[PDB]
Amino acid sequence: GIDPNYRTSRQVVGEHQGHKVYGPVDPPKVLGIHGTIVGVDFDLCIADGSCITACPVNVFQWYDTPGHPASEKKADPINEQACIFCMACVNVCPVAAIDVKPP
Ligand code: SF4
Ligand code: F3S
Ligand SMILES: [Zn+2]
């Protein structure tokens, strides 16, 4: 579900907890994609939680996004530098909102 080319096709509009945020972002309904090594489309994430339950290195943590039409929290890749590219998260997300890319 997430654009595999976001890193080159969306402008970086900001930073969040050590990771970049890829625009556009128009809160609270449009929040864009968070992260570079491990990218999560906040506009697609429905807060299923499988990715967070699946990551062996705990890259993801719940992040509140009140008033987003898709969910009031999401998986924020705050510990993306720790990713070991097992690709578990990418396979289990029910909306395919995650894209991982070796630096
Ligand atoms: S690829 Fe593996 S390690 Fe990297 S985030 Fe996804 S689950 Fe965690
Ligand atoms: S829905 Fe959101 S929580 Fe994880 S499994 Fe998909 S990104
Ligand atoms: Zn973030």
Side-chain angles (χ1 to χ4, degrees), residues 89-100:
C89 55
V90 169
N91 280 354
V92 297
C93 183
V95 284
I98 308 191
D99 178 283
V100 180

Side-chain angles (χ1 to χ4, degrees), residues 10-101:
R10 287 184 185 211
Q11 147 84 149
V12 177
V13 291
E15 230 111 350
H16 177 227
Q17 275 306 321
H19 53 257
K20 271 121 21 72
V21 171
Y22 297 77
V25 21
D26 190 21
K29 351 97 75 79
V30 179
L31 294 178
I33 290 159
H34 279 226
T36 306
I37 296 152
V38 186
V40 185
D41 186 337
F42 278 7
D43 297 316
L44 294 174
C45 175
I46 59 168
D48 176 76
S50 282
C51 56
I52 299 193
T53 287
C55 191
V57 118
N58 292 274
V59 161
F60 314 95
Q61 60 149 227
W62 284 129
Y63 170 64
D64 285 348
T65 57
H68 187 267
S71 60
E72 296 293 296
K73 65 174 173 166
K74 275 133 219 298
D76 191 56
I78 192 174
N79 302 323
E80 60 172 340
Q81 287 294 141
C83 177
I84 62 286
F85 318 108
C86 72
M87 300 302 270
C89 55
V90 169
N91 280 354
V92 297
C93 183
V95 284
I98 308 191
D99 178 283
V100 180
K101 192 132 152 314

